[PDB]
């Protein structure tokens, strides 16, 4: 039993809700919140911009030190950093950004990072400003993640479409 509330159950381990991931994280304070990161951990917009703003830019400060030490992530890769005031940990995961021409096949690799964590609050990878089809992202999530994932979909209209079209 966990403290996630109001989610629709899609499969044995995947759950979904129309919610702002920032507000969800502040309420639940989950062990792991997933950020929709880029390889440079530059948290400018989308989910990443929103999470970073909620940390008063502490996420960006920590991220800049991480990059200075380790260099960029790989597309499809991840790193674990602090969750600051939002969660215990933030798993920064890089899905392919279609608006940059990156290979959508890497979306499965991106979701595989979730399997290293028993429970996660997460967005749909590569959706929104990353330019992929969110229905596809949800399908890859369900077919790749085996741990317990709580998906927050900010757009209510998109949420209804994802539920109604879910196979
Ligand atoms: O998960 C659906 C997605 C579409 C991309 C961005 N949307 C979000 N989902 C949850 N909290 C969010 N905050 C800002 C955007 C946002 C991922």
Swiss-Prot record:
It comes from the Viruses. Changing residue 31 to A: In strain: Mu/B.1.621. It catalyses: Thiol-dependent hydrolysis of ester, thioester, amide, peptide and isopeptide bonds formed by the C-terminal Gly of ubiquitin (a 76-residue protein attached to proteins as an intracellular targeting signal). It is a multi-pass membrane protein. Residues 1-167 form the Macro domain. Inhibited in vitro by GRL-0617. It is found in: Host endoplasmic reticulum membrane. May form homohexamers. Interacts with N protein. Responsible for the cleavages located at the N-terminus of the replicase polyprotein. Participates together with nsp4 in the assembly of virally-induced cytoplasmic double-membrane vesicles necessary for viral replication. Antagonizes innate immune induction of type I interferon by blocking the phosphorylation, dimerization and subsequent nuclear translocation of host IRF3. Also prevents host NF-kappa-B signaling. In addition, PL-PRO possesses a deubiquitinating/deISGylating activity and processes both 'Lys-48'- and 'Lys-63'-linked polyubiquitin chains from cellular substrates. This is Papain-like protease nsp3. It comes from Severe acute respiratory syndrome coronavirus 2.
